Design a protein around this ligand. Structure first.
Ligand SMILES: [Mg+2]
Lengths: 126, 137
């Protein structure tokens, strides 16, 4: 396969992914503008594979950063704790919980310790 | 009011404690076969989430036919979900993911049991039909 994780990509495009085999690396580092931030985003589907829904793996360690979303997002927290700071308020999810974030939200992704989560977005392509 | 634990912020940003999401008979999908056991519980109204649909699905000892004229991502929490497409099988168990592109004619096949989150586009997946509604009038 041409990816570095384990999947079964069927002829039809239907795909299973063994998510524990998805490992982030430095090519997935997100530039927040602050080089000390440690944030990884690893898209799991090309646009050709999934033209409408985006889906990837995000990991953060001891980092809080500002970001504005151009898309709707569902985050399913696999491990750790993710805090979302919005307008001075906090919304949090730990392992096995989810967060929905509407398009246009001006947030901080805030991870005092560690978090690993799937993100599903719409649209995949701006 | 909903029957699960969530924090719905003023901004629309919402956390959900998914283990508190319990399916009930109000969520039972009538497949046509009375012995089938399928539950679908949407977790967001259209006003809450106008583009992404998201809910909890459970199945037990059931396989049924479905055509998805919408895209779907499933995260399998417990059990095993099989997707049968053109005589082939794609499977995900606890901790694994499935993507189903729009236009897929499948069987959802759960000979054992499965509990999974689904995320769809468009949001109102159950109205992606000629009737524009969840049930035929
Ligand atoms: Mg064929």
């Amino acid at each position: 396969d041409t990816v570095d994780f384990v999947r079964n990509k069927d002829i039809s495009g239907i795909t299973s992914i063994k998510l524990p085999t998805v490992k982030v690396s430095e090519s997935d580092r997100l530039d927040t503008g602050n080089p000390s931030d440690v944030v990884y985003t690893k898209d799991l589907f090309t646009l050709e594979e999934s033209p409408r829904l985006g889906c990837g793996m995000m990991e953060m360690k001891e980092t809080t950063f500002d970001w504005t979303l151009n898309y709707d997002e569902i985050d399913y927290v696999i491990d750790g704790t993710l805090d979302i700071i919005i307008d001075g308020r906090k919304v949090s999810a730990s392992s096995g919980e989810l967060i929905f974030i509407p398009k246009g939200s001006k947030i901080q992704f805030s991870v005092p310790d560690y978090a690993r989560f799937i993100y599903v977005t719409y649209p995949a392509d701006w």
